[PDB]
């Protein structure tokens, strides 16, 4: 997540190039400093750390933990989307379905053609 890519961008001790100018960057509803970023990336990491263990709470979409997830989201919603690297993050989900979907087809490739099967 952009938490992890924020560990990346500062992995080699520094960056002020445009990778950050695509990152969080609240528009009024420009190379960013380390102070400003660490401030902006603290509350979303707080929502990260608090929001996961509550998903266990009697249901993955449990109302308390799910509204905590809603806080994570809505807090991210004032902030903007982030640059082309996020395509990988979407593709990093595509590659899930690219496998998952395909595996069902692959299972169907062993199942539905050879013998009779209902639908």
């Amino acid at each position: 997540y952009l938490l992890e890519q924020y560990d990346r961008v500062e992995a080699e001790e520094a960056r002020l190039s445009d990778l950050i100018t695509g990152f969080v960057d609240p528009n009024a509803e420009n190379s960013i400093d380390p102070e400003l970023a660490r401030e902006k990336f603290a509350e979303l990491r707080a929502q990260y750390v608090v929001t996961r263990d509550t998903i266990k709470a009697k249901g993955r979409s449990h109302a308390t933990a799910q509204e905590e997830i809603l806080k994570l989201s809505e807090v991210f919603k004032q902030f903007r989307l982030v640059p082309k690297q996020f395509d990988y993050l979407v593709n990093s989900m595509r590659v899930m379905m690219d496998r998952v979907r395909t595996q069902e087809r692959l299972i169907m490739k062993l199942c539905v053609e050879q013998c009779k099967m209902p639908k």
Binding site: E12, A14, R15, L16, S17, D18, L19
Partner: protein, 130 residues
């Protein structure tokens, strides 16, 4: 930073800067996604030192040592002044041998008549003839 801005501040050009960089004599500035050499203040003042050191006369290697001291917080000012006065000594000897040059040059000159003649004593005495 942008690169031309830094080089017009410090007077250098991107070409000379990249020579210095390939010599490994300063911090390597990062690039960007596009590829612009990401300069900083550290790079700025390291460059200023690497510039003025050869102006002083500390060579590529020796100016690079001044730089890696500029990174070093332990740096021995003692050493620094040894380097200083050593280069003072080389510049002194340089001056002295150049003085020997100019002395012999003027010894040869003042003896020459300068009377648009082919019998120039300087020419024939520079060759081991006659």
């Amino acid at each position: 930073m942008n690169i031309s801005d830094v080089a017009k501040i410090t007077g250098l050009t991107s070409k000379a800067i990249r020579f210095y960089e390939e010599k490994g004599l300063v911090t390597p500035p990062m690039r960007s996604e596009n590829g612009y050499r990401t300069y900083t203040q550290q790079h700025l003042n390291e460059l200023t030192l690497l510039r003025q050191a050869r102006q002083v006369g500390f060579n590529l290697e020796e100016s690079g040592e001044l730089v890696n001291l500029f990174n070093d917080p332990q740096r021995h000012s003692a050493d620094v002044k040894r380097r200083t006065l050593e280069k003072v000594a080389e510049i002194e000897r340089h001056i002295e041998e150049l003085q020997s040059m100019r002395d012999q040059l003027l010894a040869l000159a003042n003896a020459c008549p300068g009377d648009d003649s082919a019998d120039c004593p300087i020419i024939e005495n520079l060759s081991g003839c006659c």
